[model samples]
Each structure stands twice: as structure tokens, then as C-alpha cells.
Target: PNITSYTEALDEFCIELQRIINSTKTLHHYSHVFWNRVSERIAPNYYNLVKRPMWLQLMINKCKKREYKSRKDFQDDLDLIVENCKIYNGVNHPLVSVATLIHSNVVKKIDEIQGIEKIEAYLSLK
Candidate 1:
């Protein structure tokens, strides 16, 4: 099956985001689009957001909250946000009690997409 939900995707996204942050490859310097492609490879279903989830959109805003001076500045702030999301969304996290909150909606969202796709297929008929 595809990804469970947006909340769940939020969990894995940060983990891989950390991986990119820790890499020593030449691409690391390009920090701009580094983790994006990597994460997409790992979780295409979620990373391939046709319509941005609430938190995903929020994260984009916070990550670029302002101009970044160095990689550290961006990573540090991003790491903090990563922890915030995991703790809030993780099944074991203490703060947020609502589990699969966004994920359930994500499933619904997926259903909607599939529904549209089915109809789109016939649009190419002769």
C-alpha cells in the first residue's frame, strides 16, 4: 500500500531529511534541493504531494522562515521543526493524543485522487 497518511509521512520525511543533512557527498553543498529528491525516492507517495498537506505546507514556510546564512542555520532550524513534527505526530509522542489525524484524512485524500484518476483515464478515449 502507499503511505498511510500525511501525519505518518511527516515522521519519515524528517528522518531522511536528517540523512541528507549528515551526508558528505558533493551534492551536500547544494542544500537547496538536496533532501527533496532523496525523500521523494524513499516515499514517493507522500513526497509526491499533488496537493500539499497542512503540515507539509507549514513546514515549507518555517524552513525558509527567512534568508539562510549557512547550512547550519537552516539545518538547525529544520532539525528543531523535525523534532516538533515527530513528537507531535509520532504514535509514542506525549503532546498530541490524536493519532493518524492527518493520516486518515490523507487516506481520504488518496481516495479522492484515485477517484479522479479513474475518470481521467476515459477522457483520452476516441
Candidate 2:
């Protein structure tokens, strides 16, 4: 059967997660993009000091209002926001230090190419 609702998706994901946990005996090495980490650092200073706590207040208010929703829904939204920030900051940016060497290589490549915009423009001529 097709899963149409968020509840169904949550159930399916939970089932899959349980299956993986049951089957896996060893730790799986996975990459994580760091967005919340940066946010944690910047949010307090930027939002609290500069923006007059608006962002912090909004998140607090949202949490309070959505307290009735399923736990998975709240987590999913937070994960989505974190993922968006990861992409916005760049996967290999210093914010995500999981693969420092690889990120450094990516930065070097970008430097060599003199930025992605330039590379795209240069390639568009082909």
C-alpha cells in the first residue's frame, strides 16, 4: 500500500530504522552535515543580540504551539531545516567538519577554478 500521510511515512521510517538497527552489528560510518552546530553558535549571538531575540522567541513559540503534534513531525521539520542550512552553507564548508581533508580539497578546487559562478560561466560557452 502507498503511504500518503505524514503518519504513514513516520511509521514506515520507524519500521526501516528498527530493521536497520536489528540487522546492523557494527557502527556504520556515515557523513553528517553540520548546520545546527553553526546555528547554535550564530543564533544566540545573531538573533539574541542583533535581532532582539526574535528568532529564538519564534522557535520557542513554534515548539510550544506544535507540542500537540506527533514527535516525529517536529523532528522531521527540524531535520529539514538543518538539511536546508547544510546545503545553503555548502556540504564541504567549514561548518561541516566531518571530512576536513575532503572539504579542503573541495575548497582548493573551488579556489583553483576561481569560484563556481565563474566556472559555470566559463563552461556555458561550450
Which candidate has the top score in TM-score?
Answer: 2
| TM-scores for the candidates | 0.23, 0.29
Report how far residue 32 has shifted in candidate 1, in Å. 26
- Candidate 1 lDDT, 13-118, residue by residue in tens: 3333333333312332323322232244644554343232333333344434323323344345444433444543464764232213432332343334432343
Each prediction's Cα RMSD? Answer: 18.8, 15.6
Instruction: List lDDT for all candidates, in order.
Output: 0.36, 0.36
- Residue 54 local lDDT, model 1: 31
Model 2's alpha-carbon lDDT is: 0.36
Candidate 2 local lDDT, 16-101, one digit each (tens) = 33333222223223222221233555444433333222211233344444331333443444344335434555776654443343
Model 1: CA > 4 A from native:
1-54, 58-84, 87-90, 95-99, 119-126
